[PDB]
Amino acid sequence: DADTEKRINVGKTHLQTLRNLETRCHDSLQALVVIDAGSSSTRTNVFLAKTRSCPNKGRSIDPDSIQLIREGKRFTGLRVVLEEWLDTYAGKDWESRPVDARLLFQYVPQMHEGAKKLMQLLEEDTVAILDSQLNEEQKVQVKALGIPVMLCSTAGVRDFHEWYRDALFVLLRHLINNPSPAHGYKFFTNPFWTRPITGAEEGLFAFITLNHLSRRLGEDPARSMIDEYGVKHSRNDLAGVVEVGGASAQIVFPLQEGTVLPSSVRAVNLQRERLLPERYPSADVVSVSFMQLGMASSAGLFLKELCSNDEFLQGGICSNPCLFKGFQQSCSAGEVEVRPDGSASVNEDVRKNRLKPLATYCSVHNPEISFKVTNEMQCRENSIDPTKPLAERMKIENCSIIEGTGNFDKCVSQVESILVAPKLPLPANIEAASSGFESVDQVFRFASSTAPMFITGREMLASIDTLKDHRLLRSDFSGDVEELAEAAREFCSSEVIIRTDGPVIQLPGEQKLNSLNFDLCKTMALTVSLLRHMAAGENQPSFIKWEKSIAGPDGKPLADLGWQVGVILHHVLFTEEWGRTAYEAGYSHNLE
Amino acid sequence: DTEKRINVGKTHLQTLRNLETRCHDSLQALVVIDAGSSSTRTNVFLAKTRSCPNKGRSIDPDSIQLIREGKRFTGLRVVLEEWLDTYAGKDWESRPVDARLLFQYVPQMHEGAKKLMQLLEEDTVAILDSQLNEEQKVQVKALGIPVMLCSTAGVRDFHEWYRDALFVLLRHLINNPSPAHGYKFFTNPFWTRPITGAEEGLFAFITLNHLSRRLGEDPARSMIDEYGVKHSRNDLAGVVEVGGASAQIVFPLQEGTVLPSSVRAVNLQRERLLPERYPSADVVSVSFMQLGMASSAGLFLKELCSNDEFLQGGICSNPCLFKGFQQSCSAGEVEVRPDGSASVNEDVRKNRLKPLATYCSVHNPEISFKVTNEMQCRENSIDPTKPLAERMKIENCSIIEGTGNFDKCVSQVESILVAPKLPLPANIEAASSGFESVDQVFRFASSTAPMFITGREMLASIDTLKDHRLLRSDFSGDVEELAEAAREFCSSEVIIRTDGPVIQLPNARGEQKLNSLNFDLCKTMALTVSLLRHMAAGENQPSFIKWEKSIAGPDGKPLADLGWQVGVILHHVLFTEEWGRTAYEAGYSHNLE
Ligand SMILES: Nc1ncnc2c1ncn2[C@@H]1O[C@H](COP(=O)(O)OP(=O)(O)NP(=O)(O)O)[C@@H](O)[C@H]1O
Numbered sequence A: 001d002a003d004t005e006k007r008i009n010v011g012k013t014h015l016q017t018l019r020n021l022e023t024r025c026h027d028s029l030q031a032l033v034v035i036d037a038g039s040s041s042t043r044t045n046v047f048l049a050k051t052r053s054c055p056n057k058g059r060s061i062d063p064d065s066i067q068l069i070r071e072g073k074r075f076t077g078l079r080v081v082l083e084e085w086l087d088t089y090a091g092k093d094w095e096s097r098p099v100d101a102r103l104l105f106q107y108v109p110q111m112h113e114g115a116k117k118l119m120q121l122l123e124e125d126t127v128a129i130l131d132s133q134l135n136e137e138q139k140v141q142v143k144a145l146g147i148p149v150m151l152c153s154t155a156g157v158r159d160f161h162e163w164y165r166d167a168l169f170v171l172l173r174h175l176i177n178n179p180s181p182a183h184g185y186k187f188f189t190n191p192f193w194t195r196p197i198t199g200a201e202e203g204l205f206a207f208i209t210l211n212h213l214s215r216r217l218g219e220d221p222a223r224s225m226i227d228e229y230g231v232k233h234s235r236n237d238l239a240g241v242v243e244v245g246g247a248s249a250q251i252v253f254p255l256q257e258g259t260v261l262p263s264s265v266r267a268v269n270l271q272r273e274r275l276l277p278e279r280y281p282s283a284d285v286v287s288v289s290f291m292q293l294g295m296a297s298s299a300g301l302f303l304k305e306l307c308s309n310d311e312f313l314q315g316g317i318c319s320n321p322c323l324f325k326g327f328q329q330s331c332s333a334g335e336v337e338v339r340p341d342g343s344a345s346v347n348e349d350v351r352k353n354r355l356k357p358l359a360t361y362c363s364v365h366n367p368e369i370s371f372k373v374t375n376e377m378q379c380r381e382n383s384i385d386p387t388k389p390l391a392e393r394m395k396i397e398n399c400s401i402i403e404g405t406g407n408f409d410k411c412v413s414q415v416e417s418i419l420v421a422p423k424l425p426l427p428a429n430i431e432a433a434s435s436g437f438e439s440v441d442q443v444f445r446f447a448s449s450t451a452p453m454f455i456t457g458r459e460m461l462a463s464i465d466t467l468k469d470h471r472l473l474r475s476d477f478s479g480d481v482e483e484l485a486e487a488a489r490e491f492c493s494s495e496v497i498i499r500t501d502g503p504v505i506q507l508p509g510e511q512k513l514n515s516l517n518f519d520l521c522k523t524m525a526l527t528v529s530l531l532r533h534m535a536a537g538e539n540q541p542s543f544i545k546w547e548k549s550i551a552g553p554d555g556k557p558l559a560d561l562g563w564q565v566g567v568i569l570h571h572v573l574f575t576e577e578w579g580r581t582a583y584e585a586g587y588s589h590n591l592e
Numbered sequence B: 001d002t003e004k005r006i007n008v009g010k011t012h013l014q015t016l017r018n019l020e021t022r023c024h025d026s027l028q029a030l031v032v033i034d035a036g037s038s039s040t041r042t043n044v045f046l047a048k049t050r051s052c053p054n055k056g057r058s059i060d061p062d063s064i065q066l067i068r069e070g071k072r073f074t075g076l077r078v079v080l081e082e083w084l085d086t087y088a089g090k091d092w093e094s095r096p097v098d099a100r101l102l103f104q105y106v107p108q109m110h111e112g113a114k115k116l117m118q119l120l121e122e123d124t125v126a127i128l129d130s131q132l133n134e135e136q137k138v139q140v141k142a143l144g145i146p147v148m149l150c151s152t153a154g155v156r157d158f159h160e161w162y163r164d165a166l167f168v169l170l171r172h173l174i175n176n177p178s179p180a181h182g183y184k185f186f187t188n189p190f191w192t193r194p195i196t197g198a199e200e201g202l203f204a205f206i207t208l209n210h211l212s213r214r215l216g217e218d219p220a221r222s223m224i225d226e227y228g229v230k231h232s233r234n235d236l237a238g239v240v241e242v243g244g245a246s247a248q249i250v251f252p253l254q255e256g257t258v259l260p261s262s263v264r265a266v267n268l269q270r271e272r273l274l275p276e277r278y279p280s281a282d283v284v285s286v287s288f289m290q291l292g293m294a295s296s297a298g299l300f301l302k303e304l305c306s307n308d309e310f311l312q313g314g315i316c317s318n319p320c321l322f323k324g325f326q327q328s329c330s331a332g333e334v335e336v337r338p339d340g341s342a343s344v345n346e347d348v349r350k351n352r353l354k355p356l357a358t359y360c361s362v363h364n365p366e367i368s369f370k371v372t373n374e375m376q377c378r379e380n381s382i383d384p385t386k387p388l389a390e391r392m393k394i395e396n397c398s399i400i401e402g403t404g405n406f407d408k409c410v411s412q413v414e415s416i417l418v419a420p421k422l423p424l425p426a427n428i429e430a431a432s433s434g435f436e437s438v439d440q441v442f443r444f445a446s447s448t449a450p451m452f453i454t455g456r457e458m459l460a461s462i463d464t465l466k467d468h469r470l471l472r473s474d475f476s477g478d479v480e481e482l483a484e485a486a487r488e489f490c491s492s493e494v495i496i497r498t499d500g501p502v503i504q505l506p507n508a509r510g511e512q513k514l515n516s517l518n519f520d521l522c523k524t525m526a527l528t529v530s531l532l533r534h535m536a537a538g539e540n541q542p543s544f545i546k547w548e549k550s551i552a553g554p555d556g557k558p559l560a561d562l563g564w565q566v567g568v569i570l571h572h573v574l575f576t577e578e579w580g581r582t583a584y585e586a587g588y589s590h591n592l593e
């Protein structure tokens, strides 16, 4: 009788288990792809998120479950793809000749083949990442749901003349929407996901990534709070970001208490401008991006302006204060390779020349110069003559060899007058000027916040880490200007000794000289000048932090800092709109 | 010095910037008109509305509080019966009446309903004027007053089209109030409508769980499991409500309690009673006609005094009436006079067997075409062929004498009201949910959910025994503890003293004055025993049985009274988008020319 009544409950549980399955929510794994089509390269970023489907509630993504599985190989940039197409279909050296844009329309199928070659590489790489990281059970869930692809171009093609860029984006979307059926991964896109993103957007998404990963941004009671007047506020202060890329630099910070700004200065409300949903806590954010401020673009422009000044150029010898004592290189903006024998190899290839994007923009044949006098004077003040041919524009006139003086104070003074606070704004910065900021100094002058700042960038971090490693800066570094300027002054004024082990930076410790650290003093001066303006502003940040990636709750980092996670959250957090485009329409939309 | 001076102006802008960005709270009045069996009364409520930028206006469910239940005016049944008395001729209950011919008397029905609506409107305004201050009056008048008039057991069994036609007229009368008072009353066919017995019970369940803080969508009252399903932190409690003409038995089904195919349970979310954001529950809701205080009192006297075991030589021996108590043999209203005598009102309107005898007529299509309903009437001693007066008359009976036997009273309440052979008349709704009678409820469906008893006399049955120290101060709801206490109380003698009739308890326990409310309380005491007997017989037994009048709020003061009133408000207000469209977007402005 005991085992008879026991069997009855087993069958009762059997129905209850089945009844629970049909009423509860079911979690499935989904892959998300963000293709960073930057200045330096075009690379894939494979993410994984947990989807939850509930009866009568549809399917949604858990924002906290969003984690990067791998950032793919660095393939050819969109600028190179478009420039190669113009080299073969508009003739070689089109930069110095007047080109009829109307005639290029007959070469659209040929642009499709150029883009196809790059897209096939990115597709092959994405599949290789998914196949290596996902198990058979995970692969089935990933393949069934479809893979939303978001290809966003940044500073690389931001300044690109005529139609070309926008026409390429129409072709890029068709290539994503038509993937290889062999792999099984259902990649799909739309003009809302795959599109060129603005400098403000690039900065705003980078802000969303930082606050999401650091658990400062959220709509739950753990990260937010509803006051007695029904307004949602975040429990922790929202942090701002400074991202220094290859071609552009972004300065992003939220305004505390809604500080009164001038009419010319334009701040962006995250809810009002549809960046974050209404359920999220509101914030008015200042987001500005500066062209010719990124690692490579600033490096080329600085050499052009410094070696054009009579104070630094004497008898074909340009004295650079941002380069170490004893360092010698050719007078060009071309990529510098520090060879094992101490010598500096300067590649004079047009594609590899750091001035190239600026000299291509600064052309009398580009409608932004021929019709707009303001843009012509912006080029001419930075020594680029738009009338002159491409080679003559990139060439540092009456200069043969660049010698390193190692004076840090003189380097700060020059980074300030050229890059940070110039007379006229740096070329291709109409977006920044329309926000009310002609230059970096104007940012903290007109808009200031008591919100903590996060400095992001390979060289930005390297500048601080190098000084920390040699015991020039404390392990705990709040972001003191004088403390940094004293440490860098002692480091930049150190002799280069060519020894057996190669070129060594001799300090009263020692570090080897390479292609990444040879000009780090320009970035050290940039950090000093940047922190000087932050300390000059009416409102000062609570703390300044230098970070590569944010550590997750388990200890391991969830994702890397940048606009990647921000662009995902910009789409996924709008529950109804995401469900209609990613799940209702889906990959099935592409079917014939 | 000037730093503090510029800060005043900076604060001046911040204060103004906060006002536009923040939410603003305004007071709104809500009206629920209980158009029950016994009477038609207004219930004035007050709620806090919150308007937020881009979020519209919503009501805080927890802010809903009863300010006053108004005067008890004429029931909808009386209004319609008076109209038939004058427009279909007197004694229409015993004659065949052509319903088609009554359509020419619709404007005349409007005047009859207007008279009642003007009284209810005047009373509602009198409550609002006495409780609200000038600042409160402005907010209340500006937002408009949603009115929800719902009919129950009174017109639930009403024959032909008349009831539904009255409701079309009632809504027009609400939508057109006196502009002099300033209160903007408005209604719609979704708010003002006859509510079903299951709905009446379901709303009473929603009221109980809301006030006792068992039902909520917030983390304080609810919890989300690892599979995204919202469960309530505390067990949802069931309710037993005993009105004038009907009794409701409501309880939620705990766990995977498998029910038969014939038995119909209602899921609150699926049947659009509560929003999806609220925790789900499968609820058994059943209402029984002829079980309410007034209707059950009449039916019991008819069935008991028709049985040869209780009727001898014109003297009906009632076990539910005290020893020495004497009254005339009729279901009419009993008034206990100061000289110990029982005055029985022989007026047709005041007779408690009238609604049952009016339904049990061969001229009513529910009897003439449906043989099943005729046999339901005949088994309860009502002959549908006989005239109205002959139906209400207890044949071959002159005087009702009180025997005071509690065990015999329980046995009779059981066979007549609780578990009869055929279902009690006008109970098609109950039978369609799978319950022909009260005994069948706990036999087919049982729950481990705590039960709450509601009804003036149901509470009085417990309180009287508690007062005489027959029942403990702390009473969990033990069946045999109650039966022992009531048996000693019901066996009590009635002594006609200089002060009046007194209930003399045996073994010199105590004494209390006999009145028109407690003379037949032993029938209700037996009803409570029989009801608890079936609850204890069921597969699943409630955790505790509680007897409550009203639920005490967080401040200690009670927010509102128990019943279907708060439940019907929450049924509409909790659907944020739908409520905002009907109450605020359309509003009283919809009524404008
Ligand atoms: N003023 C009163 N307040 C409360 N109960 C009363 C009052 N007057 C009479 N009663 C008693 O309570 C019963 C009516 O209760 P009530 O709550 O008004 O239900 P109802 O609306 O008339 N019936 P129903 O149509 O089924 O909803 C009467 O039969 C009396 O026993």
Ligand SMILES: [Mg+2]
Pocket: A038, A154, A245, A246
């Ligand atoms: Mg970038």
Ligand SMILES: [Mg+2]
Pocket: B034, B036, B037, B152, B243
């Ligand atoms: Mg009622």
